[PDB]
Amino acid sequence: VMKLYYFPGACSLAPHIVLREAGLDFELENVDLGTKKTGSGADFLQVNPKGYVPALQLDDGQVLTEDQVILQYLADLKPESGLMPPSGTFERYRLLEWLAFISTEIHKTFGPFWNPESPEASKQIALGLLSRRLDYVEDRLEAGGPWLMGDRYSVADAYLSTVLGWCEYLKIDLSKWPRILAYLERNQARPAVQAAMKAEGLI
Amino acid sequence: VMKLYYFPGACSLAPHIVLREAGLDFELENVDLGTKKTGSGADFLQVNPKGYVPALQLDDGQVLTEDQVILQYLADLKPESGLMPPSGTFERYRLLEWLAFISTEIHKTFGPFWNPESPEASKQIALGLLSRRLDYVEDRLEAGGPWLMGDRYSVADAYLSTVLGWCEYLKIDLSKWPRILAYLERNQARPAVQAAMKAEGLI
């Protein structure tokens, strides 16, 4: 079966949710981000050279990295589950556009806050940017169906919601964006999200 | 025909190259990043809300954003040109893995250096990280064919090379990575890259 290397609460949570949403078979392997050792004592940089999670280990033994590609790859194992617009459609690009946007624009923006050694002028700017980005999302949400894609819940929602999960912890105020707060609660109420969050110990 | 909104030298250069590599028909529309106005005086935030380049305007009139999605979308207009592994192959994911990696890991890392108001402790860390990332690329290059994908020149090479284009300007030393320097010269010697660089005024 497939093996998912994760850190509780980390972006690895997104694909973790998706494996559950698509009802795929997998095992979680916990990784220590500090010492790059896996829970079983293995050397995680043997798994993922770039040395971050999530990393997805397939049956044929290969490893996939990069949150947004892992999600795609997962969704395509079960096209019948519609976690993603079908190949060939233009809507499909709209989803990819979201995954890219979430990856560079939002996921990255939390760079500073996760760095022990970051100026404060940077975290200031991070929030600065991060805020301008959330304005756009609240826009789309105001214009759009319940999920990023409208009525279809997709992999983009597992990614976005997972990343915004961090704010409470970093103690960042989302109040300014009620729809986004609504969206977050919407995501977390989903049984597969529940089950993963419980599984990862987040509850 | 398709319309590409760009800023000379910007990441928009990547898709610009690809349009030429695939021999597609398009028009360049220059955008002023300062005032979000297009060369023709139009309001660019009407085009791309998120307000950055590149943005790709299709014939049916819609707009695509996000460098790595635009590249995909372009490559799929001409699958006969092999700028991308064919749908269904696993190699295809390897390419996507590169596009994601370049996007978050490298393209983003230049965040600070492009910001008028960035601490120096941040640009320090940027280079710090940026360096660790280039170590991996030099690895792959040392293990791999001439391009990121090995023997197939792909969209990932237009993206990576375009982004590393910046270092000379930011005056960042690549000496420590000869293969990468070799790779860069390899990219720039390609007639379609030439033609785009000339077209954008970079020569």
Side-chain angles (χ1 to χ4, degrees):
Chain A
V1 320
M2 292 174 151
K3 209 173 178 192
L4 176 69
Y5 296 87
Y6 77 111
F7 197 69
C11 66
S12 56
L13 177 64
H16 181 187
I17 291 183
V18 169
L19 289 153
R20 278 152 197 275
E21 292 275 8
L24 288 167
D25 289 332
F26 65 94
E27 346 160 335
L28 297 184
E29 170 91 63
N30 181 28
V31 168
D32 170 19
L33 292 174
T35 85
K36 306 299 216 288
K37 301 288 178 197
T38 80
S40 51
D43 166 30
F44 173 71
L45 292 183
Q46 287 306 290
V47 175
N48 180 28
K50 310 194 253 270
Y52 43 59
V53 309
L56 179 71
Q57 186 179 301
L58 320 182
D59 292 84
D60 70 68
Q62 321 208 29
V63 174
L64 222 49
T65 51
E66 311 301 330
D67 231 11
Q68 69 179 121
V69 176
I70 290 172
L71 299 172
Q72 294 195 226
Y73 171 89
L74 284 189
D76 305 324
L77 290 191
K78 310 227 76 163
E80 338 94 15
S81 85
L83 289 173
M84 225 180 149
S87 290
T89 74
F90 177 84
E91 190 204 3
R92 180 115 182 166
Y93 288 111
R94 287 307 178 186
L95 171 89
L96 291 188
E97 227 185 359
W98 275 114
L99 287 183
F101 171 91
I102 299 172
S103 264
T104 88
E105 304 311 290
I106 297 195
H107 181 212
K108 260 44 268 277
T109 299
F110 286 72
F113 311 96
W114 285 117
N115 195 203
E117 177 153 14
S118 307
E120 305 312 17
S122 68
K123 305 192 195 199
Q124 280 280 49
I125 327 184
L127 293 174
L129 175 75
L130 195 175
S131 290
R132 306 208 318 272
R133 293 316 168 212
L134 299 186
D135 292 330
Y136 178 74
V137 180
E138 185 101 335
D139 264 334
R140 303 332 300 156
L141 279 179
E142 205 218 25
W147 314 103
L148 287 166
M149 289 304 280
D151 308 320
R152 147 207 314 282
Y153 171 87
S154 55
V155 291
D157 305 296
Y159 197 14
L160 181 50
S161 73
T162 273
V163 154
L164 296 201
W166 298 335
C167 300
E168 81 163 6
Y169 175 69
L170 299 208
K171 216 107 165 203
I172 294 188
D173 160 72
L174 296 186
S175 292
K176 329 151 89 282
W177 309 277
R179 312 197 104 94
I180 291 193
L181 275 169
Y183 178 85
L184 265 161
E185 285 167 342
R186 219 138 60 208
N187 270 275
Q188 294 167 16
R190 297 177 60 96
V193 182
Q194 283 307 323
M197 268 179 55
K198 296 170 168 163
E200 282 191 12
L202 315 197
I203 300 177
Chain B
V1 320
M2 292 174 151
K3 209 173 178 192
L4 176 69
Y5 296 87
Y6 77 111
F7 197 69
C11 66
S12 56
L13 177 64
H16 181 187
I17 291 183
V18 169
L19 289 153
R20 278 152 197 275
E21 292 275 8
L24 288 167
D25 289 332
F26 65 94
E27 346 160 335
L28 297 184
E29 170 91 63
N30 181 28
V31 168
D32 170 19
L33 292 174
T35 85
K36 306 299 216 288
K37 301 288 178 197
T38 80
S40 51
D43 166 30
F44 173 71
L45 292 183
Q46 287 306 290
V47 175
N48 180 28
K50 310 194 253 270
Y52 43 59
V53 309
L56 179 71
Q57 186 179 301
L58 320 182
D59 292 84
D60 70 68
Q62 321 208 29
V63 174
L64 222 49
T65 51
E66 311 301 330
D67 231 11
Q68 69 179 121
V69 176
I70 290 172
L71 299 172
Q72 294 195 226
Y73 171 89
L74 284 189
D76 305 324
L77 290 191
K78 310 227 76 163
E80 338 94 15
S81 85
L83 289 173
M84 225 180 149
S87 290
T89 74
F90 177 84
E91 190 204 3
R92 180 115 182 166
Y93 288 111
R94 287 307 178 186
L95 171 89
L96 291 188
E97 227 185 359
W98 275 114
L99 287 183
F101 171 91
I102 299 172
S103 264
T104 88
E105 304 311 290
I106 297 195
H107 181 212
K108 260 44 268 277
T109 299
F110 286 72
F113 311 96
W114 285 117
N115 195 203
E117 177 153 14
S118 307
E120 305 312 17
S122 68
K123 305 192 195 199
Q124 280 280 49
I125 327 184
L127 293 174
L129 175 75
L130 195 175
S131 290
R132 306 208 318 272
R133 293 316 168 212
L134 299 186
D135 292 330
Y136 178 74
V137 180
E138 185 101 335
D139 264 334
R140 303 332 300 156
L141 279 179
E142 205 218 25
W147 314 103
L148 287 166
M149 289 304 280
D151 308 320
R152 147 207 314 282
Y153 171 87
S154 55
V155 291
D157 305 296
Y159 197 14
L160 181 50
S161 73
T162 273
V163 154
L164 296 201
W166 298 335
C167 300
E168 81 163 6
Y169 175 69
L170 299 208
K171 216 107 165 203
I172 294 188
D173 160 72
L174 296 186
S175 292
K176 329 151 89 282
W177 309 277
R179 312 197 104 94
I180 291 193
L181 275 169
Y183 178 85
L184 265 161
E185 285 167 342
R186 219 138 60 208
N187 270 275
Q188 294 167 16
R190 297 177 60 96
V193 182
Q194 283 307 323
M197 268 179 55
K198 296 170 168 163
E200 282 191 12
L202 315 197
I203 300 177

